[PDB]
Every structure is written in structure tokens, then in C-alpha cells.
Symmetry: D2
Subunit: 509 residues, 4 copies
């Protein structure tokens, strides 16, 4: 009686565009219809605003300071258990189709089968250096060329990837449908991880035309000048090479437009999976989760992409639908760290077998009306950072600390667009009492000096190794998926009539 699980994951989806399901101006009929079925979490946050740290954190349900995956090139240990391990241990068939940005020779991390390679490298190339602050590496750093180069194309590096990811995921759903009717079956858990709407902001003409009438192509907060920016936002501008880009107003609208178009481009792929689940008669016993690793500022405050804790960068959608899930909207802040314990909870796995391996909490009690009190923690220690940054999100507050930065405190009920720093300009004795309470919480959770030393050791270690691994013949760690052709379709060690019935589903119709 254990259910199936379908995890639909996109990269770089600004959670603010999902207030109660997709925003009304978004042309996303399938994600909207899924929202009406699902328990939606309005204030869900990432664990680290970046591909590799968030995804390694997402898989294991552990903070980057515990997974040791500090940036886009830190090695992910094979020994770290993920939700793939937990479900597989409980009898689940686990599969990943798409991107998880595993760095290191391990590219499965518990997944029994991976349907595609990764769009992004798996080596120690994108290693930052805290030793040299202010330096940027042009051949892999983010720059504002994604904004000035936004436009329309029929194929891209990301669309070739997502077309492959979407097809192979639907092929696996069709394959697993053949194992229905058999009740010695293993429940399957397939993860469909798309790269859109990550930059470049380029979409196909069919979806680009859907947003001709759009008015949300202008950010809520305009471009804050550099000298009025907080130190961390300045560093992000430094790492984006702002000085060599004149981003016009049209560059901002076109980039937001193709971003919105690529969301619709994804909503068509979500509808394919739902349609496949419906025609294969697996939809009723399948949990469906929507999630994302981090967000995109999308020009707000003059910032693009991620690498900060602002709402656009730190917030990601989170929706859970399926049998036993009561639909509704939830406002208590959640974290991506809670996905792995929630997945095991829905899979009947006992809480004592997940407690010592995740730092998050199961959301199933929250779905059924039980109040959650645990705060939401966020860390970052990659590019545009010269020392680790930590962040706490509790109730209506967001606290951000960095040993080189003045602290930030935001009342998100009274200041949704975080423009007033309550740590610098407190409103009253309650703001100062809240700031002191978050300082005690932060010191109880983080040793910021050991955090910095651990990140520096990780960087200096991987560099010496990477300079060596890049001499002589290179040995790639990119995952090479193999469907054995000598065991597919018709081979002369079977029987044609027996094979045709076994590959056909539904049968007898």
C-alpha cells in the first residue's frame, strides 16, 4: 500500500512568482491545476542560493555546513545518505532524470538509475578562493550577458537538455506502468529535474509570444546604485562584471519575458507527466511534488540570478499533491531541508530512522493542521562571498549575518520588499529585542570561524588536486547512462508473443 512519488524540480525559480500556486499573470495551466490539488507552502526557502550546494542539501536534507558541499565544485561524499537511499532502503525503486549537479566521481548518490547525464560539470573546476577576495573567473562566473543576450531561439543548450529530460522521464513512467497489476511490485520514485528557467533567458517563439501583453516585465524594486547597496550585494555586482554591461530597460523586460516564457515551456512538460500518469492509471497512487533549488532576483534591486538571501533569490515553490494530502495554503516558513524527511514520512519510513540523518522536519503534520515551530536556516559560502553567510527565517523575521557585513533584519509582514534594515534602523525596543534573540540563535547554531576555516580548507585542497587532474589524459566523472540495447525490444532469447503482452499496458483491452 505504499504510494509512488514523482518529484518535479526546476532550477532558478523565483518563489515569489508562486504566491498560492503560480501567479495569475503566469500562463501555466498545468501547474495551476496541480496547485489546486496540492498542499502549497507560500514561504518555502532554499538551504543555499546556488545549484550544487542547494541540491546536495536538498538530496540529503542537511545544511551545506554538514554536507560539506560549500560551492559548485565541492565534492559530494558517497557516504552521505539522501532521500534516494532512504526510499531505496524501504523498498522503493529510485530514478533521477535530469540535473542534480553532483560534484565528484559519484553521480547516483543512492539513485538506482539515472536516465540522463548532467548539464553541468562534475569536476573541481568552479572552485572559489577565499584567499583572493575580489577576483572573478570569467570563464565560468555569472555575468550580465545573460540579460543583454536574452532573446528567442528554437534550440538551446538547456532546451536540448530539458527536452531529453522530459522525454526520458515520460518513457520511464510508461515502462513502470508495465509493472502495474503485478502486486509484488516495488513502489517507484522518479525525480524529474529540469534546468529551466535558469539563464540564459532564451525561449522558443511559441512561449515567447504568450507574454506579449505582460506588465510584470518590470521589477518591483529598481536598480539600487552601487554605493547604496549592502556589501554583499556589491560583491554580487562585482562577480557579475556590472562595469562592462549597460543593461537597458528593454534588456530587463526581454530577460523577464523569456524567463516567464520558459516557465510556460516547463508547464507544458508538467502537463505531459500528468497526462502520462493519468493514461497509465498511476495518478491516484502517485504523490507529486514541485520544488526548486533556488530563485532568481530577476532584476529586482538591480541584482540578477542568486547568491544572496533576498526573497527573490532565497524563496522557492513547494507543493505536495497526491493521496492522503489535504490541499491548502500554508504560511509558516518552510525549507528545502524538509523535503527529505517529508518524503520518508509519506513513504511510511519511521521517524527514528531519519532523525540522525536530516536537519529538517517532516511537513506531513503541517499538512494536517499541526503547527510547526522550527526556524528556517540558510547558508552560503561560494562566489561573491569572502566569508560564510548565514541566515535565519522565523515567523515574520529574516536575520542575515556575516562576519564582514553589518547584520540584516527584515519584518517581512510590514516590509515584503526588504527595503528597511531593522538591524541598522530599528523601529522600537521590540526590534532590538528580536535582533538580540537572533544573535543568540545564530551563535548556538554556527561557529562562523570554524565555518570559514572548513571552507578555506575545502578550497585549497580541491585546487591542488584539480591542477593535477587537469594534466595528462583527463578522466571524466560525467555520468554515462546505459540502457543495455542487447536486452531491449525483441531479442532471440525470448518469445515474441510473450514479450508483446508484457510490454503492453493496459492489457486485455
Amino acid at each position: 500500500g505504499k504510494p509512488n512519488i514523482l518529484i518535479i524540480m526546476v532550477d532558478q525559480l523565483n518563489g515569489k512568482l508562486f504566491p498560492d500556486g503560480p501567479a495569475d499573470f503566469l500562463h501555466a495551466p498545468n501547474l495551476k491545476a496541480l496547485a489546486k490539488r496540492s498542499a502549497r507552502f507560500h514561504n518555502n526557502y532554499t538551504s543555499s542560493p546556488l545549484c550544487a550546494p542547494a541540491r546536495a542539501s536538498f538530496m540529503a536534507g542537511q545544511l551545506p555546513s554538514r554536507t560539506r558541499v560549500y560551492d559548485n565544485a565541492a565534492e559530494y561524499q558517497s557516504s552521505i545518505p539522501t532521500y534516494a537511499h532512504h526510499l531505496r532502503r524501504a523498498g522503493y525503486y529510485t530514478a533521477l532524470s535530469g540535473k542534480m549537479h553532483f560534484v565528484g566521481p559519484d553521480q547516483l548518490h543512492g539513485f538506482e538509475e539515472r536516465l540522463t547525464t548532467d548539464i553541468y560539470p562534475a569536476d573541481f573546476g568552479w572552485t572559489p578562493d577565499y584567499r583572493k577576495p575580489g577576483e572573478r573567473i570569467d570563464w565560468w562566473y555569472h555575468n550580465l550577458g545573460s540579460v543583454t543576450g536574452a532573446g528567442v531561439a528554437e534550440i538551446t543548450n538547456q532546451m536540448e537538455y530539458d527536452d531529453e529530460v522530459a522525454f526520458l522521464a515520460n518513457q520511464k513512467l510508461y515502462q513502470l506502468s508495465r509493472e502495474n497489476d503485478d502486486e509484488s511490485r516495488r513502489p517507484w520514485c522518479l525525480t524529474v529535474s529540469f534546468t529551466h528557467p535558469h539563464d540564459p533567458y532564451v525561449a522558443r517563439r511559441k512561449f515567447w509570444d504568450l507574454y506579449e501583453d505582460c506588465e510584470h516585465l518590470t521589477p518591483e524594486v529598481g536598480a539600487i546604485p552601487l554605493d547604496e547597496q549592502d556589501p554583499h550585494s556589491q560583491r554580487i555586482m562585482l562577480s557579475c562584471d556590472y562595469q562592462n554591461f549597460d543593461v537597458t530597460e528593454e534588456n530587463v523586460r526581454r530577460s523577464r519575458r523569456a524567463y516567464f516564457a520558459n516557465i510556460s515551456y516547463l508547464d507544458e512538460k508538467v502537463g505531459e507527466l500528468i497526462d502520462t500518469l493519468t493514461r497509465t492509471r498511476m495518478l491516484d497512487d502517485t504523490l507529486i511534488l514541485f520544488c526548486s533549488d533556488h530563485g532568481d532576483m530577476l532584476g529586482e534591486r538591480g541584482l540578477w540570478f542568486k547568491m544572496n538571501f533576498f526573497e527573490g533569490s532565497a524563496r522557492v515553490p513547494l507543493m505536495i499533491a497526491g493521496p492522503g494530502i489535504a490541499p491548502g495554503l500554508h504560511l509558516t516558513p518552510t525549507s528545502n531541508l524538509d523535503v527529505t524527511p517529508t518524503l520518508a514520512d509519506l513513504a511510511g519510513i519511521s521517524l527514528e530512522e531519519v532523525r540522525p540523518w536530516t536537519d529538517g522536519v517532516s511537513l506531513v503534520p503541517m499538512v494536517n493542521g499541526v503547527e510547526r515551530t522550527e526556524p528556517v536556516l540558510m547558508e552560503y559560502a561560494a562566489e561573491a562571498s569572502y566569508a560564510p553567510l548565514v541566515a535565519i527565517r522565523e515567523g515574520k523575521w529574516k536575520y542575515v549575518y556575516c562576519a564582514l557585513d553589518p547584520e540584516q533584519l527584515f519584518d517581512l509582514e510590514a516590509d515584503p520588499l526588504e527595503l528597511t534594515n531593522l538591524a541598522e534602523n530599528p523601529r522600537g525596543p521590540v526590534d532590538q529585542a528580536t535582533l538580540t534573540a537572533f544573535r543568540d540563535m545564530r551563535a548556538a547554531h554556527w561557529d562562523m570561524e570554524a565555518f570559514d576555516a572548513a571552507v578555506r580548507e575545502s578550497q585549497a585542497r580541491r585546487w591542488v588536486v584539480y591542477e593535477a587532474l587537469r594534466n595528462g589524459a583527463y578522466y571524466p566523472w560525467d555520468h554515462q547512462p546505459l540502457q543495455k540495447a542487447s536486452e531491449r525490444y525483441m531479442r532471440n532469447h525470448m518469445n515474441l508473443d510473450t514479450l508483446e503482452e508484457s510490454k503492453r499496458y493496459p492489457r486485455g483491452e
Copy 2:
């Protein structure tokens, strides 16, 4: 040597498509909008025939433009040697990039046969398992022979072995066009030739609910010619009926209607896959420079005369569609009989290859003159030496006549103009002195083209040779010959020996928009 200006070629192929369903493009009752739109653009050949009504022999013949008696690929498990040049060889030698996505039923260790790249594996085996034996006439091998279980088991399903195959044949083909589109703004570009070979509408007659619903108000669910009893059937048809084990099957009338309905539905399932390729070609801005061919390897009787599947020379099993559209092709309908043997020399001709370099390697003729209104007089030849046959059968199609010979059977001759549904054997019941003179003329033609005794000897030797070899190869550890496609992941997408900004621009098309 010229290089630029040569067109792209997209060969859309389907398996077991009755050519009678394509009289002037798709028949009106068929819900095939994309194929109807491609037809009116193309030079359609009304009377196109296969080379051999069987999957593997027709495909080795289609590739090389040679008769099965020349390719030695007599049945569904005869070795296709590497040295035999195919149109993939001719185009590739002329500077084309050649790619195959789908089924070609190659038997042997060579699964490319000139193709520079092959995107999928084959749906059917590549060993000597399906080898018939002329030494044992009357035998039947249940584990791979055709049987009427496809007719009694026809129906609806959302996934099948064939639908899984065609779904990834189609996707990988469109992904390759997207990939090839990135090379479009390059003047030094190699012209590409991509073959998309689908397995549908080959049986089982099982289609998705969406397409099965399209044919609820259909009237062609009953064959034009009902089931001829075994006592009144020609010797070859009875052999096909016994090789299908029709005795252990009670085909209801509803069995026929369901089989045909799913067959037409899977034609619509294919037509939607045709529109994807056309739409990919159009949006990638490659449509105007791309010749498009639609063809098939053999037909399907679909219950006509009580027969199903193929392995005979009747119109339903021997006739296949053939349409060519694109630059330099005047649309129109042609009635002179054509053959699948003509595709290879036609492809080489359309691609600027001099036919002096192709004629010593093909038995057919280029259809390019016929497109431009030139009269073609070469006859259409057909062979068969596989299951349900105890000796080779040969056929000649010329003008309005079709003559079928076998050393063990009475001769057959039909006047397809006066007798489209072949019910009057003019060899057994001539209408006058002309039919008697026509029968004599084809006997002299057949004797001039075939040594039917040496034909039977070469087939018997090829079967016995394979039975000793396949005996050993199935002992001990098996070494498979199935094609394993490999797109090296260490060289796709973003890898840290490239530049991220340069990669994104190269993998993006169209550029600058």
C-alpha cells in the same frame, strides 16, 4: 569538386503500410492531416512496389537498391555483409552526414552499413535466429512466426513495445535536427541525410485511446474482399495461412474491425509524428533546403482475401507509398509502376551524385526523370524466398500487368486496370489471345532475369550455413550484435574544457534573436 548548394534529405519510413491506403497521398477517410499536407507538396507514385514482402529482405534491398537475389538477404535472418554499398555510402562518399534513427532490421555484426551515426538500437533481433529451412517444407516455428493472435488480440493500450520504440525514434530524430540546425549558418556545412524509420503500423494492432477514438465513425473496417476459404485459395496463400496457424484461431468479424481500426489509428499516431518533424524543420529554418521522402518496406493485407500481414505479391502486401517533396521537385501523381529499388539511385541523383557511379551498384533506376515528366519503361521486379515459401517466388509488374511465378505453383497474371482486386487469374482463365500472348512474354522476361534453380540453391545454402553457425553461437556465452548507440556524456553540455559563454552561443539557434 562542388560542396555547397546540395540539399538536405529527410527519409521518413514506416513499416507494414498498405500502399493501397495511399492512392494520391493518404486516403480521405484516414485522419492524417500532416501526411495529406506533405502529399500535395510531393511527387506521389501511385503504383510503387516493394522489392520483397518481408521486413529484413525489403530493408536490405531498400538500402542498397539491389534485389534480394543480389544482396543475398533472403529472409529475416540472412547476413547483410558490410561490403554492400547503400545509399548511406553513396551520400557519405559525396560529402553528406548520414544518420539513422529507427529500424532497418540489419542481420549481422554490421548495424550501420554506411550510416555515420545511428541514434537507436533495432527493435528486432540481429542474429540468425529467424532462419527458415527449405529442407523441411511444411514446418512452422511458433516462437517467431506470424500468427493470427494479433487479429484476435487487437485493442487499445497506452504503451507497447512498438510505441516505446517509435516514441524514442521520433524524439531522437527531432533532437538530431535541432542539433543539426546549429550548423545551419555555416557555409562549410556538410549536408545531412537523416532517416527516420518507424516500426508502426506493424502489428500488434494496438493503438492509444486518443488515436483509437479518431476512427469510431469509420466505414473501411471491413476488407473489400472477404475471406476466401482454404479450398479456393492459391497454393501460396494456403501456405501463408498454415504458417499463420489460422486453424487455432476463430477470427470474429469484430476481430477484423478492431485490427483495422487500430491499424488506421496507428497511421494517425504516425501522422502526428510526421508533423513534429515538419514543425522542427520549419522553425529551425531548414525546411526549404530539405528534400522529404515518405516510404515503407512492405504492406499489409489487413484481412483482404482472408490474408493478413505480408509474404505475398498481392496489392495489399506488395504495394507501398512513395512520396518525394522539397526543392526541385514538381508535385504530381504518377501511375507508371515504381519500385523500392528506385529509392537509392534516386537519392544519389537528387544529391548531385553522377549516376555513372551508382549504376554498377543498383538494380533500380532514378525517378528524377519521371518527376520532370519523362517516361519510364523499366519493369518492377519482386522476389520472395522466406517463410511460407518452399521455393523462391518472383514477380514482374509492367504496365497494367502483374505476373507471379513459382516452380511449385500455377502461374498468376492479373490485369490491374480491369481487375484492381485481383480475383481473375488470367493465366488460368485467359480472356483472349492477348492474355495468352502476354503470359508468354512474361515467361520470356522471367527466364531472362532469373535462374530459379540456382536461386533455390543459393537460398538453401544460406539457410544450412546459418543453421550450423547459429547452433554454435547459441552455445556458451552469447556475444550480441545489437547496435548500442553512444552519445558520450563527457562531451555534451557544459564541461570544463570549454568556455561557458562560447558554449551557450554555439548551442543556441537561431542566433542573435
Copy 3:
């Protein structure tokens, strides 16, 4: 179900390339340092007058494997495709329940690199595509980048590693490792009998050997050929075609070049002989020697400077004769003089392996040598063919009794009495001794015309060449798909992995057991 294999012997076929059969009169010659091959000869039935089917790597080997003439295998040259459907002795043995394995060279051209073999331990040293295709349409031309040239003679010498030596060392090691692996199956009575083929490239040129073996022939006297260099004007038309195909015009072959070439050639024979002892010792120590038939053979010979010619591609004795020895259980030792052929190996192996001759007769052009081993007289003649480089039309040859008759439509016929003319210096076709020579010549013309239609032969070779040049030109455009064999011993299934038992693993991999 499983074929009956009780009481059937193992078969170890030791093969070499370019071994002049005249160096094996009654086993290895006396002057050769070959203790292990000499010990094997005194155990074995020795066929003094064994001949190749075609003097060249690929045509002889496709013929050797199937027991069919090149005209039947269609493998005319070093680039002709070997069809997968042609049954070989690997097929025949494997059909009867044998485990078949090949370690070394067989020069298969085409996508099939096994041809019945269940396991191949190495890749091939030579290409598997249609590159080395001759063209009868351009007679007199030569292709420098793969044709034989006399640089092998002028560059003969000493080296510790070569392309061939890296290969044969890998061939010899994996052969002994496979014998070691099979020895663990040795106390199982439900085991399959094995047939392992070990094919070495030596003593194929380059004539380069290691110092250890080169020093063995410091005192040698056979460094000068029995027949000196014949001038080009006094050579037969075919020998002239071989000389120009070897680019003799731009090579000043000194006598010292001849001695160094023969010395390194003889040294590489001792190099091979030490590898023979390694195999014999592995059989002895694994306790599989007494149930294992051992066959020594070669694909063709080498002229070694005799008549001024080098390498092969001709029907003279030094190029056409190869050794053939059969040792093991049931084989009575002795020397045999009736001419035999490499075509006979395949039916012989099937006869020794208890396979009924009615299942191999329709697939071989040779006869079993087992009766000859047991004193039964053999009357079938030895047929040879050649249709490759240095030839502009196919050549054929008949070897019967004391005569050798060579015919080519472009050449004067050749007839030699090998009893009276062992070094074939008198062409009895041109200068008959009496009325018997004229009658014998006519008898061979009738034998030839009954076996070969030299017109259809020349047409088939020309079709095979032109068909490949079209395909090969295309296959060498764009991304190349290689056909070379890639051996794979899955590392995930070797040694100690964590799905087995450690103590059960050691006992199963240990042999002998209980000692």
C-alpha cells in the same frame, strides 16, 4: 540439452605467421635453438610437406579457420570481408560442446572479429577494415603506406621492444592466464572441453629480435640463402611483380643485410620457442597436459632472401610451405611425407574432437589427417590460390606427389619435380626432360580446368575490389567507426567483490585443491 562431451580432449593450437616450412624438416631444424619445439616434435605427427592455402595473412587465415579455399571464402586479399555466416572450426567445436578461445592474431576483416570463437583474449595487430584493398584495374602500381618493401631487410637488427613483441608478449601471457583459469574447472566432470588458439605474429617481419635471442645465432652458418639473388631479367613474371611491389629499385640490399635479417628471423623463432615452453609448462603444472592435443602450424612462409625474394605472395617452397605438427592423446608420432594443406586442419580438429565427418564434409575443402596419422594413405592433392598484391590476375597451384604445377593466365606455366629439384630451379613446363614431363603437364592442366574457372575467378576478385573501394571511401569520411576487437573481462565480476564469499572464493580460484 547440453551436447555430450565426456572423454573429449582439450585442444591447444599454437600458431605463428611467416614461418618458412623448410625450417621444419623433421621438426625444427638442427641449427635452430628450439628446445621446446623439438621436444614437441618428437611427441607429434610431423607433416613434412604441409602447404598453405594462400601465401598471405588474411586469405590464409580465413581459409585456415573454415577449411575452405579463398575462392570459396571470397577472402582474396588482406582487406576482403570475412562473412559472419561462414562456419569455422570454432563453430564446429563450439557446436559439439567445446569452449573456444582465441589469443592473438587472425586478421579478420569486417565487423565480425570472433567468427565462432566464444572469447577473444586480445585485439588484432592488423587492421579490420578495407584499407589494404588491391585494384586489378591499376596493375603495376603500389601503395607505399602498407605494401611490403625491402626496408625490413636493410633495417634488421636488435631491439628490446617492438610492435610485434609487445603484441606476442600480451598474446603469450593472456594465453597462459586463460589456461590457468580453465585449470580451476579441471576436477569438474560436467566441465566443457576447451580449445584455445594461441596465434603469434612472429617471425613476421620486421626482422627485429631481442639481444638475448640474437646472441644465440652468433655462430650460425645458415645466414646465406640456398639460392642466391636471381636478376630481374632472369626472374619469372610473377617474381618480377613481387620485386617491384617491394620497391627493390630504391634499396641496396647488401649481403650483411641478408644475414642480419635471417639472424633476427632465427632469433625470433627462439623467441617463440621460449613461449612454447611456457605454455607446455603451464599445461604440465596444471595437470592438463595429457588430455590436451597440441597443434603447431603457420599461415604461410617466408622466402628469406632465397632467389632474391623476401616475404610471401608466391608459391615457391620457402613461401608456400609451413610446419604442421599434431601431438597429444591418441596421436602416434612419426614423420609424414605425403603433401598436406592447411585446409586439412579444420576437418582434422573436428575428427579428433569426435565430431561426425558427415557434419563437416559439406563445409570444408580439405580432408582429415587422422587416418594418415594411423598409416592410411592419402591421395587428395594440395590446392593453393593467390589473388592479391603483386598479382594482376588470380594464380592457382596444384601439389601432388612429387610435382608442383603453378598456373596464371598472364604467365608461363611452372612445373617442378621436388624430388629431383628441391630448390625449384628447372621449369619442367618450359624445359621438359622427356615424354613423362609433357604427359604430367597435360594431366595437371586437366586437373586445373576441372577445379578452377580462372575467368570467373578474375571477375569475382575484380568485383570484390571495386565494391570495397566505394564503401571504404565512404566509411573514411566523417566520424570513423572502428571494427577492431575490444576484449573485455568485466572487472565487476573478477577477484573479490561483496556478493560472493571470501573463503568460498579462494577455494574456487585455487588449483590444485586440497594440497
Copy 4:
């Protein structure tokens, strides 16, 4: 001008059998000839008396507490630099032929090329459990059936391995000899790591017959009954299932005889490698290193195999020969940790580039007569242990500590056969000053409870992941060496006569 380096390594070579080169009674003529050329280290020790922890420590020059490779199933992370990395970074071609017991998906660890797979598994199967002390695991633990099963065989799993290891190593040397006339040649470093003389004690008859007149088939210490043994040796006896084995004296003699025979089996393979180097004319420019991971008690004290710090299990040979090495004997205790910094030193690498990555010291100064003062550290935290054990080896003393065991102090000058525990029975006023000094040294180098916590976390982490990875289809991590045949020997994209000259060496002769 940088020299070649040949590292010949063996598993479980009792260091006491190599006092000043091979012992006289051992028939090792090739290793004795190499000893006369090399700097010989009489008192060299392992970092950890176990296969995988020692080699992980041997590769990186770091203690098992730093590499986190505590047992035969602990993950060796890819970011840890090894001497392969250091040499590869310095322009060396690095190759490994043989066994290194890498656990995890990385089977290269800086090695540009690996010629064979490993003889032992690479997953987390052999994982101990501190939570269940006193309970062994039958299907991979050591048992004394190796002693009762010693004998003669012509093929074993280890000999098939070492025969392949030795051949592919000599083939690589021949292959590298072709590059030997280029001035732009990369210096090569080939590591030939054999598995012998690891148990099973089974040898070929040719070598077994060499030791018929031997008088060393009896251990110097007889079997110490269980009640008189130290607690650690008692757990070793229980972890070996000693109660289910009646070990005859002939069982002891046959085990040592096959062990000594396999040393001669290795000495012949050593002579092969030297002969290959000599004939290819690379001998004069090649440094040769003989070493081992740990030793074997060989019945001494009634113990077999390793897992302890006694001389027979903790001592290993270490010899360095080649250009720029002065032959001679050395008695100051050295460690396997010193090999990686010694290799970098001999390869011209600056000491400041390996200083932060190694816990050892370069032995090159000691070779030239400079006194070495650094003590030798050893750790163990695997089977037959319920808590980590540490050990210090300085001057003439060896101190062993464990939180669950009485301390041990041995004066190896007066007590080479460690029979008198000076910690329990002191002799004079120095023996208790010395024990107090080693307690200060041990407390300064080791947090024994943090050590026990890290080992326990590693064990519980892997038991969860391995249980999952062993469900469904298994993904093997074993190394698959592949020399692509499409690029070897004669292929038709080359020139035949150009190829024969390039593959022939020496040329022109």
C-alpha cells in the same frame, strides 16, 4: 632532468624479515641485490595495520584520522591529494598497476592511468560496527583457516592477480621506453602494487620447494594462551574465530613456508622489473622504492595477520635506490607517512607545496646523514577494536594507548621480542618518566573521544547507505581498465613503416 620513479609494493610483508635487505634465509637474490644499492630503513612502520587504511594513508602521507579512512570500507574522498597528485602536478606521468584498496567511486586518486582493477571490493561492505562489540562477520572477517589451509597450488586468486600486475607493469615500462629518446619526455612514476604475500598462504611448487631446509618455520614467540594475552590480542583472537580451529605446529610450519615461498615468488617478479629497466636503458634514471602497507605476525605470540602494533604486524620494509641516493642502513624509526613527502622531494617539488598536505617528513636528509627527530605515529580503528588505538614509536620506545586497554611500553633495544610491558612492570626511574612523556605526547596529538565519535559516525553513515545501495540493481565502483584497441598496433589511419619505427626501441640497431 627529473628522474623516473618505480614503486614496488607488497601487502603484509613482515618488516622483521627485512632487517638489512631481505633476511639471509629468504631466497630473494633480486631484492638483496637491490638492497645493496638502496638506502635501507631498518625500523620503518605502517600508519595503520590494515589493507585499506594503510594504503589510503600511504598514498596521501596523512594519518587515518586525517584521511577519515578508518577501516577496509571507509570512503576515500577524491579531493584528498596523494603523491600521484603531487607528482602529476609536477609534470609526471603517473600509473598504478595493482592493488590499492580504494573504497568509493574514485579508483584513481590522482593516478593518470591504472592498469589493473583491484583484488578487493570498493564498496562499504566490510564496515565494522562499534555499536555491537564482540560480534564478528563470517563472510569477510579474518579466520585461521588460512593457517589450516596453507598448501601448494599452481594458480590462486592472488597469483592470477599478481601475474597480471607484474606483466602489465613490464609492458608499461616497455611502452614508456619508446618515449625515451625525446627531450620533451614526461618523467614517469609507475607503482607496481602486488597482493602477495597476503594470505591465503598458498604458493607454487617451484617456490615451495625452495624452503625445505628452512629453520625459520617456527615463530620466535610461541602461542600465548588467551588468559595471559593483552585485551587487544584477545579480541583479535576472537575476531579470528580461534575457538573453531585446531592449529597444528605443521599448520604453522606450512603457513610460514608458503609465506616465505611467496616472497621468493615476488622476488622473481622484482627481477623481471629490474631486467626490463636495464634492457630498455632506463635503469640509471629511475628511482626504485620497495615498501609495504603492513606486516604479518606469522604465528608469533599465537597471533596471525595484522590489526595490532606489535613488531610483526606494524613494521614494513622500506628501501630507496637510484640516482642521487647513497646506499646505507638507517635505524631511526621511520613511517610510511614519510613516503609521499620523500617522493615529492626526490622529484624536485618544493617542500612548501607538500607541507600542508602531509603528516610525515622527507627522508632525503636522513639518506644524506642528517638526523631525524620526528616520532612515528600509528592508529587503528577497525575490526578487533571497540575504540581507536594509537601508538607512538620514538627512539628505542614504543607506546600504545587505548581508552579500554592498559597501556603498553616496550624498550625495543633490551626487548626486541616485546615480552615485558614496561608500563605495567617498570624497571627504573627512567621508564616511568618515559611513560609520562608519552602520555603528554599522546594527549597533545589525539582527542581519543573525538576519534571514537568520528569513527562511529562513519560506521553508522555507511551502514545506512550500503543497505540501500544493496537493494535493486547494483552499481559497481570497481575500476575497469581499458586500452582502446582501436588505437593500438597497426590501424589504417597511420603509416606502417612509420609505426614500426615508433614502436621499436632501441632504434637504429
